[PDB]
From Swiss-Prot:
The chain holds residues 32 to 62 of 62 of the full protein. A divalent metal cation 4 binds at C3, C4, C14, C18. Residues 1-31 are annotated as: Alpha. GO terms for molecular function: zinc ion binding. A divalent metal cation 6 binds at C7, C11, C14, C30. This is Metallothionein-2A. Belongs to the metallothionein superfamily. Type 1 family.
Length: 31
């Protein structure tokens, strides 16, 4: 399971609880 749709199963900003929230299709914590 990924955790979001703005970061694939290989992001280096979602290895400590998906922080991507408040923006769909894009984020600002892994941008
Ligand atoms: Cd994301
Ligand atoms: Cd991420
Ligand atoms: Cd995530
Ligand atoms: Cd993010």
């Amino acid at each position: 399971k990924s955790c979001c749709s703005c970061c694939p199963p290989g992001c280096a900003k979602c290895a400590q609880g998906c922080i991507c929230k408040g923006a769909s299709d894009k984020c600002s914590c892994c941008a």
